[PDB]
Every structure is written in C-alpha cells, then in structure tokens.
C-alpha cells in the first residue's frame, strides 16, 4: 500500500536521517531488497496519446488517454489489455484481437522509440521537479529531472532504491536507514517522496 509506505517514509524522515553525529549509510544497505521492477525508460506523448514506459525486464507499456493500457511483454508477442475499469485480457501481437491494431501500432512506435507477475503503471504525474510512477505492485518510483537521480520505493520490503548522479545503483532498507541515517540529498528525496506519496493518496 501507499499507507504502509507513507508510514515507513514519515518514519525515516521523522528521524531526520541526515542530521547525524555519524551517518553510516553504508550499513543501511541490503542487496536482498532490490525491487524486481522499475521503469527503465518513459515517453510522455500524452499531449497526443499518452505515456509509454519500459520496464527493466524490457516489456513496454502505454497508459493511454482513455485510461486503457496495452502492455507488450519482453518476448515481443504477448499482450495484456486493461480496460478503463481494470478488466485484464491476454492477447497476442499475432492473435490479432481485431479492434486493437491501432492501439498495437501505437505501442510498437513507443516500443521502437525507447529501444531505438507483470506490474503495469497504475498512474503517474509530473511536477516541475519530477515524474511520479505508481506501479501496480505498489512501488512508487520518482525520477528527478535536474540531476537524473531516481528513487524507487517498494512498501513491500520497506526498501528504498536510489540510482544517483554518477548512475550508481544503491538499495537501502528504509528502517536500517532509520538506524544509520543517510546523507542530505537522499534524506531530502525521501521528504519529497513523502510529499509525492501523500498526493498519490490525496488526488488518487
């Protein structure tokens, strides 16, 4: 949930992780918390059709402007269609689901554009600082525009994954992180994320 998460975030922040006598952020790491999913790439052509995104497993998905979303698996043929209400259909690029060929061409453009158990995007939204991606499996991912750093948050393991400026991958157990603290920068991203999660529950 976003409540579990919000609880965990409110918590690590309440603790002011960066105003420490000694910040031993190295110790708050945990290689077993690496989330299974995150958005490798995204494309906001939503002024026209919507947001196309690529999961780290290389499956591509587009959440259209009808709130319908087509997801092409990383094998290239399999499809998942989620209607405006959430019904889930499993078709195929070759099986030809009649009426889906316009939609399927729009996905291949997004697929081609980005390359040139599967959790889809529940919803998203940008602010001037970042784009927020809320995945069905519960993780809120926040990609910050300015310095290209990223926060992927999984409420299932109370874990925060932080891809930084140099492009290094680092996963922290939010609460260990609440024992050892972390540098300013990550501590402020968790505050931002906190605000972002509130909102995912507010406007939701």
């Amino acid at each position: 949930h976003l409540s579990d998460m919000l609880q965990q975030l409110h918590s690590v922040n309440a603790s002011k992780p960066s105003e420490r006598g000694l910040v031993r952020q190295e110790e708050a790491e945990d290689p077993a918390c690496i989330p299974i999913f995150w958005v490798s790439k995204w494309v906001d052509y939503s002024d026209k059709y919507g947001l196309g995104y690529q999961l780290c497993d290389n499956s591509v998905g587009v959440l259209f402007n009808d709130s319908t979303r087509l997801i092409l698996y990383n094998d290239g043929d399999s499809l998942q269609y989620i209607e405006r209400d959430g019904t889930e259909s499993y078709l195929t690029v070759s099986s030809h689901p009649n009426s889906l060929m316009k939609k399927i061409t729009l996905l291949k453009y997004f697929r081609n554009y980005m390359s040139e158990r599967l959790p889809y995007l529940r919803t998203w939204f940008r602010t001037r600082s970042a784009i927020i991606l809320h995945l069905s499996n519960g993780s809120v991912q926040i990609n910050f525009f300015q310095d290209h750093t990223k926060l992927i948050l999984c409420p299932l393991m109370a874990a925060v994954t932080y891809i930084d400026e140099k492009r290094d991958f680092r996963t922290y157990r939010l609460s260990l992180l609440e024992e050892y603290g972390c540098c300013k920068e990550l501590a402020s991203r968790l505050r931002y994320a906190r605000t972002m999660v509130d909102k995912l529950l507010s406007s939701r």
Binding site: V39, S40, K41, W42, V43, D44, Q54, M114, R126, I131, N143, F145, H148
Partner: peptide
C-alpha cells in the same frame, strides 16, 4: 517536454 534520457 521530456522523456527518460536513455542513450
């Protein structure tokens, strides 16, 4: 404006 940054 914008998309992911890849490449």
């Amino acid at each position: 404006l914008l998309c992911s940054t890849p490449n």
